[PDB]
């Protein structure tokens, strides 16, 4: 077993629940016997950790496409880059 | 998305479960069964 870090893309493992993503603290309230949550489409979006008895939100680790804006190579060699639906801090 | 949880004739739907109870020569055969199914489903989505 080991400590738990929050707000970073990690590879987590809770009891056998295996995935990767960023873990934050939440405003859900499970039922004492409930061990993890999942949403429509049945993806895990919350979990309970088996030592603090606190529930944590799971968010996939940012991803997206990359597009390059070219004014035409017959005019210049400059380009701009768009990182699609990504906040600017994470590049 | 609901098709990401079908076996298509494999031991599970998770790649971290075929890469944990099978040696590489046996996990190829089980990964290909998932690849074929998921490709079929994506291409049906793109035709419709």
């Amino acid at each position: 077993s080991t400590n738990l870090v929050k707000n970073k893309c990690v590879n987590f493992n809770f009891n056998g629940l295996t995935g990767t993503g960023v873990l934050t603290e939440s405003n859900k309230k499970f039922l004492p016997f409930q061990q993890f949550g999942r949403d429509i489409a049945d993806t895990t979006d919350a979990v309970r950790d088996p030592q603090t008895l606190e529930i944590l939100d799971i968010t996939p680790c940012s991803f997206g496409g990359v597009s390059v804006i070219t004014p035409g190579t017959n005019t210049s060699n400059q380009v701009a880059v768009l990182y699609q639906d990504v906040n600017c801090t994470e590049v | 998305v609901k098709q990401l949880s079908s076996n298509f004739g494999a031991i599970s739907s998770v790649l971290n479960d075929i890469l944990s109870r099978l040696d590489p020569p046996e996990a190829e055969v089980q990964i290909d069964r998932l690849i074929t199914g998921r490709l079929q489903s994506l291409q049906t989505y793109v035709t419709q």
Binding site: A41, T43, P60, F63, G64, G65, Q84, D85 | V1, L4
Partner: peptide
């Protein structure tokens, strides 16, 4: 135009339209 606007994950993304 208001009454009308009130009446009506893993590799998947939604792109915004060019005209708002």
């Amino acid at each position: 135009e208001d009454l009308l606007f009130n009446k009506v994950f893993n590799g998947l993304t939604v792109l915004p339209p060019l005209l708002t």
